[PDB]
Amino acid sequence: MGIVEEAHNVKVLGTGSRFIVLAHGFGTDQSVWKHLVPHLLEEFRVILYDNMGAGTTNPDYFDFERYSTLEGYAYDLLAILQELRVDSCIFVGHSVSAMIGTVASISRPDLFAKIIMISASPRYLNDSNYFGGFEQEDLDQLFNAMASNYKAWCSGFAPMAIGGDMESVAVQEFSRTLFNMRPDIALSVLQTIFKSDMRQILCLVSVPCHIIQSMKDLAVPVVVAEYLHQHVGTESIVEVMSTEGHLPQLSSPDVVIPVILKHIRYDIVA
Ligand SMILES: CC1=C[C@@H](O)OC1=O
Numbered sequence: 001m002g003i004v005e006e007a008h009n010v011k012v013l014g015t016g017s018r019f020i021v022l023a024h025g026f027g028t029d030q031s032v033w034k035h036l037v038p039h040l041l042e043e044f045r046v047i048l049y050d051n052m053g054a055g056t057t058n059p060d061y062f063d064f065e066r067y068s069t070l071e072g073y074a075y076d077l078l079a080i081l082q083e084l085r086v087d088s089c090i091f092v093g094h095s096v097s098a099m100i101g102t103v104a105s106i107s108r109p110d111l112f113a114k115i116i117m118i119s120a121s122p123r124y125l126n127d128s129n130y131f132g133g134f135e136q137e138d139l140d141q142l143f144n145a146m147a148s149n150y151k152a153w154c155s156g157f158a159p160m161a162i163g164g165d166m167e168s169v170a171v172q173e174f175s176r177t178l179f180n181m182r183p184d185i186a187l188s189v190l191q192t193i194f195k196s197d198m199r200q201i202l203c204l205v206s207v208p209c210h211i212i213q214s215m216k217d218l219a220v221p222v223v224v225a226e227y228l229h230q231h232v233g234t235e236s237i238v239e240v241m242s243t244e245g246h247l248p249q250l251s252s253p254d255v256v257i258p259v260i261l262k263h264i265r266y267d268i269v270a
Pocket residue numbers: 024025026027028094095096097193219246
């Protein structure tokens with residue numbers, strides 16, 4: 001394996017000709033895609049990778065300056081796509097990875113045939129002019145909790161992010177990946193995500209975007225999906241699903257997998 005492949009736990013599965021890249025969100029890893037991957041093996045070559053800072057990655061590679069902005073993660077994605085020699089791909093970014101691929105696509109639009117966003121937001125904090133879902137006090141509270149008892153925070157956060165029954169399998173799975181992060185990395189990364197503001201780069205997007213989210217998502221009001229639709233600088237489409245949860249591809253795969261497959265297969269009218 002190449003040096004980049006190894007560092008990000010890169011996997012390339014399936015026997016298709018076209019590439020599809022699945023990029024996971026905060027607190028989880030490439031296993032979040034477990035219900036989707038079996039349906040792509042015949043049509044594509046599926047690229048899975050882990051973000052630096054996930055519990056599956058080496059904590060000594062986490063460079064706090066590099067990842068102080070989402071650009072740092074976008075550089076990692078480009079490096080992965082280069083090492084693998086992708087010509088073009090369909091990119092599926094979950095949570096923060098939606099914006100990471102968006103940033104990457106502005107530097108290299110040739111690499112991206114289409115972006116599919118799941119549980120995406122360009123900004124979580126409110127503005128007298130924009131509703132992201134959170135005030136600064138909400139954040140201060142979250143971070144005080146994380147810093148004071150990470151193990152306890154993971155147990156209470158997991159059911160909230162996942163939604164539905166608090167003793168479900170998906171909650172256990174997310175709870176476990178959450179606690180596998182080094183607490184100071186988890187704290188730093190979630191702060192970086194919650195403070196971010198990508199609104200101004202949306203009009204520069206030149207790759208069509210499919211914007212998918214649960215109707216009940218603790219971190220993404222439904223109006224943020226409309227916001228991304230309005231401000232993305234090219235063709236885009238919204239699909240709000242009748243599901244609850246920030247990781248719906250994991251907690252409601254029976255419902256969510258067909259939606260993602262639909263947006264992989266069909267294209268938006270130019
Ligand atoms: C999983 C997730 C949390 C959200 O705030 O952004 C993400 O990446």
